[PDB]
């Protein structure tokens, strides 16, 4: 509380590095909280003119999940400017080409349409897998919780839980499976 002016300023406006796991998580729900952190809407000292913005490192990008049939229905359209250079790539094809591109475009879309968008994007780091350089790993402060609870498979369930779950119906002995 009783700090000098310069250290108090540094502590108040210090930058923070957050971690975000992207395995089995929806891009929209990941990148919404990502955009919140990049803007700095989680700081009571936030202001549009101030440069309050934190770094976010998103890992496990290749293992992303889309709700519904978005993998085959969602498209991304770009144009090279030249005539006949208008391309529309499906979400699955775009993910197979560049895993980072999906989350990158989601964050770019939900970031504000001002000139600060490029500045806050330059503070964003996205990695397809759990391969982060040590120089970045040494900066991480905390890891944000996953926005979606990953459901377990049948084999991931414990045997005691399986026996605890009741059998709703009784199959007949004469039937064949």
């Amino acid at each position: 509380s009783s700090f000098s002016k310069a250290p108090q300023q540094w502590a108040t406006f210090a930058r923070v590095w957050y971690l975000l796991d992207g395995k089995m998580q929806p891009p929209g729900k990941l990148a919404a909280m990502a955009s919140v952190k990049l803007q700095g809407l989680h700081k009571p000292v936030y202001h549009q003119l101030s440069d309050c913005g934190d770094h976010v490192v998103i890992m496990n990008t290749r293992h992303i999940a889309f709700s519904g049939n978005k993998w085959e229905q969602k498209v991304y359209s770009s144009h090279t400017g030249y005539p006949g250079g208008f391309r529309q790539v499906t979400a699955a094809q775009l993910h197979q080409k560049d895993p980072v591109a999906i989350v990158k475009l989601a964050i770019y879309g939900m970031l504000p349409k001002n000139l600060h968008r490029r500045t806050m994007m330059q503070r964003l780091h996205l990695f397809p897998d759990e391969d982060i350089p040590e120089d970045i790993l040494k900066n991480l402060v905390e890891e944000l919780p996953q926005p979606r609870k990953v459901p377990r498979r049948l084999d991931e369930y414990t045997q005691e839980e399986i026996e605890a779950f009741p059998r709703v119906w009784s199959p007949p002995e004469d039937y064949r499976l």
Partner: peptide
């Protein structure tokens, strides 16, 4: 590709251009 709450079949839906 990871997916959930998918309604149709993956091989039957055409992308919406």
């Amino acid at each position: 590709l990871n997916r959930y709450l998918t309604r149709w079949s993956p091989r039957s839906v055409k992308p919406i251009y």
